[PDB]
Structure formats: structure tokens, C-alpha cells
Amino acid sequence: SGLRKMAQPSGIVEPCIVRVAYGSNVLNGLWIGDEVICPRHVIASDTSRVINYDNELSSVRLHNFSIAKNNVFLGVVSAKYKGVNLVLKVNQVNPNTPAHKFKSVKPGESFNILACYEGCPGSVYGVNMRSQGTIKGSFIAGTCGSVGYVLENGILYFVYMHHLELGNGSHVGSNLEGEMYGGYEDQPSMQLEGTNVMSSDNVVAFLYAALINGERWFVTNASMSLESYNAWAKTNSFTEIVSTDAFNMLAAKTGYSVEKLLECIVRLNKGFGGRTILSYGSLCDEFTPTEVIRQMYGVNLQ
Amino acid sequence: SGLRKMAQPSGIVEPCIVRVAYGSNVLNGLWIGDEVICPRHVIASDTSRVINYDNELSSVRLHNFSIAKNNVFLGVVSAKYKGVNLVLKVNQVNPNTPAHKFKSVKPGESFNILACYEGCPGSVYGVNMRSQGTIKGSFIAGTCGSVGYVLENGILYFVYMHHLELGNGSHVGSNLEGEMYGGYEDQPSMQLEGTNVMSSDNVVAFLYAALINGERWFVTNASMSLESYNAWAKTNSFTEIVSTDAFNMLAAKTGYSVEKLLECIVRLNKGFGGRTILSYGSLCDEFTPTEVIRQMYGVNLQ
Ligand SMILES: *C(=N)[C@H](C[C@@H]1CCNC1=O)NC(=O)[C@@H]1C[C@@H](C(F)(F)F)CN1C(=O)[C@@H](NC(=O)OC)C(C)(C)C
Ligand SMILES: *C(=N)[C@H](C[C@@H]1CCNC1=O)NC(=O)[C@@H]1C[C@@H](C(F)(F)F)CN1C(=O)[C@@H](NC(=O)OC)C(C)(C)C
């Protein structure tokens, strides 16, 4: 029993983290093959005013880079922008490059953050991509370049590189192609996050987890069609459910239909009445159906 | 900005996990050197009735063990009890044995759980040892033998191996010397957990983190001495603060004294009144002062 936000093991990613320093800036880079990827703003001369990245790459001095992993320093051969990321060809192939692919995470999907501090892997935790392309993590100075990843059907996927934090505390990053999530820009300009839309798929899985544990106070006999629930969701800042097929095992083992839980959401969306579901005071959308299944009946851990 | 329960990177521990099966029981073992450690109840024939471990070790058939790591199967040479743990001498040294030590965590101290499912490392997350020697994690069938660890001053410490779950959902394990935390017995008896005592040191760190992030609704002009709070905490299931010299840094740069936060605890212990601190609905004692400092000003990462 028990539900906890988790991260997939990080051992495969740790050997790819390097310290990247340029001028007075220090952050992290991803060393895979003969290439080091890091946020391009590390070569910006002043991150307090608008940045002319064209005029930063053209004045860059390759010898002024300092890339290191445990007293092993790499020389930069060439530098180019891949989106908002610098792609640095280095003079040494990473001997510990794992088999890997690249992909982007979508709203509601969970992935792992390897929080790195000035080149030192420090912690690992699970996160969830929000509707506006942001995550609510724990990033501070020197953690840019921290990598996000997911393991699926035994394949490492690099899906996130940290770039900045918005004024409201939300954390913005990019994919490994340099496309910033949510369309945000790596500039010190005032940028706003829209209304957050809660993942209905994850809230259903969250309620399934409570039932599996033994918490049943919020359930009744009432049900609601995915069509009636989707109509409400479009006006209550909730996503629309595309299928119940992802909840087949949960429904089979609990004996509760997705529609019965769709009704619990609209009813519980008005207030838990001082009550609690798995120690949470309101609806939680941080656990995906896969995350719940992995913890309750350790199946398909990747 | 941001506070999230995190785990230290697990790459150093992952290569020590093996699948241990005996008869119909399947769980995890820690393969370090020429020895594999796992909960001794893996040789129990019936885990629904009292177990005579003396008569189980005497009837044990070493060849009935199945220990494997990928395509590497290990042969058991000898077996002995170290407390509640089975110590199995094997015919092969783990080539990836890391430098390590063993120690026990104390109440209020945090550590990392590498959740393994029948020999497959599946996830990693942080936990906090409670006063009664239990943790509130997420363990299910087949996760016994999952190991807890901490990285301190560049030293890997093995500090936990999971054994069982109590009727109230609390999770029980032992250190690697075989001493069950909290004094529980590795028997299917209906054992009881006493009143949980909140770690005052960790709740203070939690409030410091909230202030650093930007929350202040809970702040008043009042403060409370450490003698007055300690007297209040002997009767409200909170630990006694022995010294404020663990928060000098947090108090110095937040501009709030421990005494102010001690008053916030006594008042907030009666309910947040619908409000939330860092998204929590009640006082949280799961973050140690060190954990907070690590996330707010990345220092002492190990
Ligand atoms: C990378 N190490 C930091 C991470 C940042 C520090 C505090 N909280 C965090 O997560 N990233 C940055 O410093 C970027 C780099 C600059 C720019 F994005 F290229 F312009 C500015 N950065 C910011 O994060 C700023 N945020 C912002 O620009 O909002 C538009 C702040 C938060 C002011 C550092
Ligand atoms: C190991 N894989 C499991 C983990 C267990 C499964 C469900 N929740 C968990 O954490 N551990 C066990 O099955 C032990 C082994 C037996 C014994 F401890 F040796 F007696 C029984 N176990 C239990 O966990 C039981 N709990 C218990 O004994 O209370 C003291 C339950 C969960 C009732 C099987």
C-alpha cells in the first residue's frame, strides 16, 4: 500500500552530466557522444537585459569554455545553436554514452528530473508537464542544464533541459531539439503562464489509487458519461478523457467504472469538506495511470 | 524556487540489486562483495502463521535459491542470520561493488529508497524515518529487500532494507546489520505502532522553506522561546529542540528567528483553516534542515 511521487532510476543518466562554465557563468551540460548540450544563455554576457543571441554566438571564444567531469576537462572544437540550446562538439567521446532517443513530453505526462548543481548530480525526482508547458519543480541558480528523462519499454528518452524560472515560480525548459516548452523565450522579459488545466486522466488514476489502498468515502452509486464530463471539463479548467481503455486494469481490480469516478471529480471539485483522499486535501493530478499501476501492482515499470 | 521531496542519485546502488527467489517467495537482495543480503522471511514456508526461523535455516536447501542479475546467476555457498537478515555467501564477487559503510538512521532523518520489484530497480524516492521506527513509503508484494541509502560526505551508507507493512499501512525495515527499526519482529503478528511524534526540527525547516519561497500568511509578530516551546512539545507529540544552531543560515538570510517559527508551529498545529503552506494542508515534518538548505542554496548536496 501507499502512494508516493517517484522517479525512475537515474544511474544511466548520471555519467552524462558535465559542468559547463563560460566567463562568470556556471551550469550543467549533457555529454553524449562527442557533443555537450547546455542552455545557450551560458554565453550571454548579461542575463539581466534582453539578449542578442546572434551577437553572442559570433563573439564566442571556444577556448574560454570550461567543461569538466571529475577533473576530466574537454576541449570545445565547434559551437552552434540548436534552438535555445548550444551544441558543443568536444574533443572526446563520452565513454559512458547510453543508448538513447529524444522525444517531447506532452501535458499531463510525467518524467524524471536529475537535478544537477554546477555539474554535480544532486537529486532526482518525478515531475509532470503542465498544460502551459511548465513544471513545478525545485530549481535555483546553477541548475540550468539539468536534464529530464523517461524510460519506456527499456529505452532512455531525453525530454527536458532546464532554462529558467518564471515570475510566478513556474519552471521552464526545452526539449533536446531546443524547442522551449510552452513557447517561452530564454529572455529576462516578463512572461506569463496561462490558466493551468488539470489532467482528468491523472485525477481518475489518483482516485483509483485511493480505492486500491482502501479509501472509499468519496464514492457512491452515481456515474457520468465521458461526453457529459468532457462538456463540464471544458468550462472547469479540466482536460477531456479520450478513452477508459487506460483504466481497464484499475477498473477490473477495484470493480469501479471510470464514469463513476468522473462523477466523483465534479462532486469533489467543489470541496473535500475538510476530508482527505490519501492525505491530500484536494484533487491531485500529479499521478498518471501508468504511475499508479506501477506502484500498486508493479507492472510495466518502463 | 520550489520545494520537492527528492532522492539522492541512485546510480551507485543500482548495480548491487539482485533477484532472490526461494520456493514460491521472490524478492530483492543486495549483492555486495561475495555476499547477498535479503530479508530472512524469504525462506519462510508460510507467512500467514508464526515462523520458526531456527527450524527454517536448519531445513534450508541452498540449491533451492535462485539469485540472478540479468544473465548472471549466483550460487549460494552458505547462509547465516544477521539479525532479521539472511546473509548468503555466493560464489562470485560483485564486480560493481561500491565503496560503502553501514549505519542506522535516527528518527527525523531522511534517506533514499531504491524501490526494486523482484530484482528489477524500479524507482527512487526520498523518505523520512518516523519516531516509531516506521516510514510511510509505497511498498507492495515483491519489493522486500529494497534498500535505503544515504550519501554523506562522499560516503555511501546502506541504512535500510524493507521487510513488511503493518496493519495501519506503516512500512517496516531493518538496517543492514539486521536490527529491525522500531523493534518490530519479522513475524505476521498484528503488531501495533505507537503515537507518531513530529520532528520539530524538520517542521521549522519546512516553515523556513515556505518563507524563502514567498509564503507569509501564517506569520505574526509573536515569538516563543525554546523553553516554552519545548514544554509545549512534551505534551503535543512534537520533539524537543535542543539547539537553534542548525538554522543559523536559514534564520540569517530569511530574517526570521527560530523562536518566531516555534510560535507558528504551536498555532498552526491546530489546523491551517483551509489554507496551504507550500501546497501542504498541514504541518510537514518530512524535510530536514539539511534537505531544505540543499534545495534552496545547493550546498552540502551529500
Ligand atoms: C539557470 N541556472 C537559471 C535557473 C533559475 C535561477 C532561479 N530559478 C531558476 O530556475 N536560469 C536563468 O538564470 C535564466 C537565464 C536568463 C534568461 F532566461 F536567459 F533570460 C534568466 N533566467 C531566469 O531564470 C530569470 N527568469 C526569467 O527570465 O523570466 C523571464 C530569473 C528567474 C529572473 C533568474
Ligand atoms: C515483501 N516483499 C513484503 C512487502 C509487503 C507486501 C505488502 N506491503 C508490504 O510492504 N513483505 C512481506 O510480505 C512480509 C513478510 C512476512 C513477515 F513479515 F515475515 F511475517 C509478512 N509480511 C508482511 O508484510 C505482512 N505484514 C505484517 O506481517 O505485519 C507485521 C502483510 C502486509 C500483512 C503481508
Burial of B92 (0-12, 13-18, 19+ CB in 10 A): middle
Among all bound ligands, the one having the nearest atom to the CA of A119 is 1
Residue B47 — φ and ψ, nearest 5°?
-90, 15
How many residues does the structure list for chain B? 302
Q: Classify strands A100-102 and A155-165 as parallel, antiparallel or unpaired.
A: parallel
Cell numbers given for A127: 515531475
Query: Which of 3.90.1150.10, 2.40.10.10, 3.40.50.720, 3.30.450.70 would CATH assign to domain A14-90?
Result: 2.40.10.10
The Cα diameter of chain A in Å comes to: 69
Q: How many CB atoms lie within 10 A of CB B277?
A: 22
Interface of A with B in 136-155 (CB under 8 A): 136-143
Query: How far is C-alpha A145 from the geometric centre of its chain's CA atoms?
Result: 13
Q: Classify strands B171-174 and A100-102 as parallel, antiparallel or unpaired.
A: unpaired
Is residue B105 within 8 Å of residue A262, measured between CB atoms?
no
Q: Which fold has domain A100-183?
A: Thrombin, subunit H (2.40.10)
Q: What is the domain partition of chain B in residue ranges?
A: 14-90, 101-183, 200-296
Cα–Cα distance between B109 and B129 in angstroms, integer? Answer: 6
Residue A133 — φ and ψ, nearest 5°?
80, 15
Among all bound ligands, the one having the nearest atom to the CA of A190 is 1
Beta-carbon contacts of residue A236 (< 8 Å; ≥ 6 apart) = A266, A269
Is residue A42 within 8 Å of residue A84, measured between CB atoms?
no
Cell numbers given for B157: 551508507
Q: Has B120 been annotated as catalytic?
A: no
Could you identify the atom of ligand 2 that is nearest to the CA of residue B166?
29
Tell me, in angstroms, the distance from the centre of ligand 2 to residue B171's CA.
9
- Asked if the Cβ–Cβ distance from A136 to B294 is below 8 Å, we say no
Coarse DSSP helix, strand, coil percentages of chain B, rounded to the nearest 5 percent: 20, 30, 50
Q: Which of A2, A126, A169 sits opposite B139 (nearest CB)?
A: A2
Beta-carbon contacts of residue B77 (< 8 Å; ≥ 6 apart) = B62, B88, B89, B90, B91
Query: How far is C-alpha A94 from the geometric centre of its chain's CA atoms?
Result: 25
Q: Which of B117, B136, B137 sits opposite A301 (nearest CB)?
A: B117
Cα–Cα distance between B168 and B192 in angstroms, integer? Answer: 8
Cα–Cα distance between B178 and B134 in angstroms, integer? Answer: 15
Please report, to the nearest 10 degrees, the dihedral formed by the alpha carbons of residues A23, A28, A34, A35 taken in order.
-80
The amino acid that residue B232 corresponds to is: W
Coarse DSSP helix, strand, coil percentages of chain A, rounded to the nearest 5 percent: 25, 30, 50
- 3-state secondary structure (DSSP) of residue B274: coil
For the packed helices B200-213 and B258-268, what is the interaxial angle rounded to 10 degrees? Answer: 100
Interface of B with A in 14-33 (CB under 8 A): 14-15
Q: Tell me which method was used to determine the 3D structure.
A: X-ray
Gyration radius of chain B's alpha carbons: 22
Cell numbers given for B54: 531456527
Q: Has B41 been annotated as catalytic?
A: yes
Report the candidate in A130, A175, A167 with the shortest Cα–Cα distance to residue A148: A175
User: Considering the domain B101-183, what is its CATH architecture?
Assistant: Beta Barrel (2.40)
Of B38, B144, B264, B284, the active-site residue reads B144
Report the candidate in B293, B280, B281, B268 with the shortest Cα–Cα distance to residue B200: B268
- Asked if the Cβ–Cβ distance from A8 to B123 is below 8 Å, we say yes
Burial of B234 (0-12, 13-18, 19+ CB in 10 A): exposed
The Cα diameter of chain B in Å comes to: 69
3-state secondary structure labels for all residues of A80-93: EEECCEEEEEECCC
Q: Which fold has domain A200-296?
A: main proteinase (3clpro) structure, domain 3 (1.10.1840)
In angstroms, what CA-CA distances link A17 with A10, A70, B11? 11, 10, 13
B294 contact residues in A (CB cutoff 8 A)? 122-123
Cα–Cα distance between B268 and B252 in angstroms, integer? Answer: 23
- 3-state secondary structure (DSSP) of residue A242: coil
Of A144, A162, A173, A284, the active-site residue reads A144
Cell numbers given for A69: 567531469
The answer to whether domain A14-90 and domain A100-183 are alike in fold is yes
- Asked if the Cβ–Cβ distance from A7 to B123 is below 8 Å, we say yes
- Asked if the Cβ–Cβ distance from B298 to A140 is below 8 Å, we say yes
Quote the DSSP letter at residue B98: P
Residue B165 — φ and ψ, nearest 5°?
-125, 130
Report the candidate in B101, B100, B169 with the shortest Cα–Cα distance to residue B137: B169
Query: How far is C-alpha B198 from the geometric centre of its chain's CA atoms?
Result: 15
Q: Establish if A288 touches chain B: CB-CB under 8 angstroms.
A: no
Residue A49 — φ and ψ, nearest 5°?
-120, 165
Question: Strands across the sheet with A76-82, in order?
Answer: A73-74, A65-68, A17-22, A25-32, A35-39, A85-90, A76-82
Is residue A167 within 8 Å of residue A112, measured between CB atoms?
no
B277 contact residues in A (CB cutoff 8 A)? none
Beta strands in B75-198 (DSSP E): 76-82, 85-90, 101-102, 110-117, 120-128, 147-152, 155-165, 171-174
Quote the DSSP letter at residue B72: E
Rounded (5°) CA angle A5-A148-A2: 10
- 3-state secondary structure (DSSP) of residue A172: strand
Taking CB atoms within 8 Å and a gap of at least 24, the contacts of B298-302 are: B298/A117, B298/A118, B298/A122, B298/A140, B298/A141, B298/A142, B298/A143, B301/A117, B301/A120, B301/A122, B301/A123, B301/B8, B302/B8, B302/B151, B302/B152, B302/B153, B302/B154
Quote the DSSP letter at residue A238: B
Cα–Cα distance between B126 and B256 in angstroms, integer? Answer: 28
Instruction: Write down the H helix ranges in A137-270.
Output: 200-213, 226-233, 248-254, 258-268
Label residues A117-154 b or e (16+ Cβ within 10 Å = b): bbbbbbbbbbbbbbbbbbbbbbbeebbbbbbbbbbeee
Is residue B204 within 8 Å of residue B247, measured between CB atoms?
yes
How many CA atoms within 13 Å lie on the side-chain side of B2? 23
Cα–Cα distance between A40 and A57 in angstroms, integer? Answer: 9
Pocket of ligand 1 (CB under 6 A): A 27, 41, 47, 139-144, 163-166, 171, 186-189, 191; B 1
- Asked if the Cβ–Cβ distance from A298 to B165 is below 8 Å, we say no
Residue ID of nearest Cα to ligand 2 atom 32: B165
Q: Establish if B98 touches chain A: CB-CB under 8 angstroms.
A: no
In angstroms, what CA-CA distances link B116 with A186, A294, B10, B12, B139? 39, 11, 12, 15, 9
Cα–Cα distance between A137 and A128 in angstroms, integer? Answer: 9
